[PDB]
Amino acid sequence: MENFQKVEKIGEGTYGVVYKARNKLTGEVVALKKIRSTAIREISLLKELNHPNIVKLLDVIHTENKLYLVFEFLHQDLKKFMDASALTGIPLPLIKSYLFQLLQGLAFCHSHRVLHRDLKPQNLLINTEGAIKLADFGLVVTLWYRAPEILLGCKYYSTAVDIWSLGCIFAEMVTRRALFPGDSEIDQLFRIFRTLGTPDEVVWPGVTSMPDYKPSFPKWARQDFSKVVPPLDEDGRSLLSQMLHYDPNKRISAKAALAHPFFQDVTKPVPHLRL
Template identity: 40%
Template sequence: MAMIDPSLDNGVNECVRRKKYASRSKEGHVGTVIKKTTCDLATIPSSRDSRRKPKKRSKLFKKTRFSVRGNTANLRYGRLDEYEVLDEICRGSYGKVYKGKEKETGRMVAIKKELDGFCKSSYREIDILKSVVGHPSFVQFKQVVVDEYKDDVYVVMEYIENDLRRSMKSMETPFNESQVKALMKQLMEGVNFLHENGMMHRDLKPSNILVNNKGELKICDFGMSRQFRRALGSYSPRVGTLWYKAPELLLGAEKYSCAVDMWAVGCIMAELFLEDAIFKGDSEIDQLQKIFGILGTPDDIVWPGFSSLPGSRFKFVEQPFNMLSMNFTIISGLGIDLLNKLLACNPEERITAKDAINHPWFHEKSSTS
């Protein structure tokens, strides 16, 4: 017969009592096997006041609490009421980001509300944020926060004043070459760290790059990121933001590599000089037309396997020349060389992050200061 254990919580003992008396058989004997209860302790009334019914926690809270603690090792877990949620900073495909304040310390933080709850992309993002903790090129993860009584899950990170997109718009004069070098060096060091540790960002763009008042750059928003084991794997091409998507993704390639990140890095470098996106299509086909109009239309000679990609069946305007240098008269020859290597249509010819960091452009004395 099940015994009442005085060391247990009153709610547990009450649950055992109920199970004991509910398990009488038709003959009136008390059963000797008590089924293990799965009820939430927060919803079991105390034996002192069986009429009091505390507010139930949401199903998502119970599920999230188990998932976070069970599947993500050493993950700090907290409650939303530890923070004061202030203004909304931005909104993305997977969540809204708010400016917040930690009540205990008064420190400012960024609080990202996961729009789809704690889904697969959330796990990926947190795994990667944990992997880059301590690296200066990434926003620092603090903890996961759950609202106990609503279906809301949040990720708390360090707060950075501006993103690169807003910085460019608010500046009276564009970045000079020396400033672009400083920013690109930090960006490439962060991207190189990701790639060397088996991670792709897959959504690099100015709004996902934060810059503080000291000029320190931090990569954020890993909702579309992916860890990989092989240099070239099969993944979904439905990732990234249109103006920064590599040609292989626009053409529907399901096998691609870290080169998709390097294309986005090249688009960002061009935008820092132009103060606007270099390729501004309104559809995937139009985006490809914009790319080929400046870099030249590829074929199987310059890009082996081009005709086998799903999107290559469309008829693109024939443009045989690379006219990139005509759009960047203020950049040195070495700067154009790096930009051409970042924006190579053939991903096999695109420069790696490791080689880009060591490109001679970074060691060349800039003509502007």
């Protein structure tokens, strides 16, 4: 520290606060995450994880107890953007450009066996150029984007949890209302089951053996995708249902998703934003 002037608190992060600040010497505006040995380690791989779709971890000043993370500074997050576009909605070409880049980022860190684990509109940042970046990785909290295997007690979940979370984000950008706005784990799970149908050994081998599966869960039918994501076209739905498959193994990878016919016509338009 001491070389940074906390300009303004801009949020509450995963394990610490986040401030907008000037590098008292450089003059450049940056983003700080203040937080509360194995750690420093997982952070090392983070500095050498450069991709146009991942926020840039600039420095890591570890000065006695308090540990700071210095990131490049981004213009705005996706929740705010969505909030600001609620009356008209986000134009498809843009919704499409963003999904494409995000999948590019995911494909990248999945290659390096790094998962995000907590993907959401608030952990996605954008700039005036039309780029979107994945932010705040992992190791009154929200559960709407939780994959079903995590809610069922799987302790060794894969990179597929991210595809699921992205799947939920995709739908929300198209319909403008969260897909599964649960308020408790069991509530979350039931909203999922009431839409995609209650999973059984047929669609999810091993599901009934999961730590938190109860033979007593109600048995709901699976709802038509025409009703769930109405304005989305058929290519969009193919993809959405493949990102939302119960079985983590049959759930589509980031790599494959990038080749889905839904992206044939993907362009890179710029957003109109109020900073």
